[PDB]
Amino acid sequence: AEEPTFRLEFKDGVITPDRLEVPANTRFRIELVNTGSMPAEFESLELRKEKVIAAQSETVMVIRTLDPGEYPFFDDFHPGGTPAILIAK
Ligand SMILES: [Mn+2]
Ligand SMILES: [Mn+2]
């Protein structure tokens, strides 16, 4: 594996970890693991990125590149859940 790979757990709107530092200007992967009972949707407004993860399932999201900066994200299917963030640096 020559690509950095991170992991986020989604569980009924709670995202862990809620803060993820990632490299900027770099292609990388995030394993999105939904351990809850409802489908989840990774969504970031700024990045225009949305990815569904069915309950009790996993999918691996590819981020092609991020300019340095901070990118809030959340489970769009569970409003009021964790406001998480990617910190690209
Ligand atoms: Mn959505
Ligand atoms: Mn929404």
Residue numbers in the entry: 44 to 132
Direct quotes from the study:
FtrABCD is a four-component iron transporter found in several Gram-negative bacteria. Previous data confirm that FtrABCD can only utilize Fe2+ and the inner membrane permease, FtrC, from this system, like its eukaryotic homologue, Ftr1p, is predicted to utilize the free energy released during Fe2+ oxidation for the transport. Periplasmic FtrB from this system is coancestral with known copper oxidases, and the conserved D118 and H121 are predicted to bind to Cu2+, forming an active enzyme. On the other hand, we and another group predicted that periplasmic FtrB (10 kDa) is a novel cupredoxin (Cup-II) based on its common ancestry with Fet3p (a multicopper oxidase) and other single-domain cupredoxins.
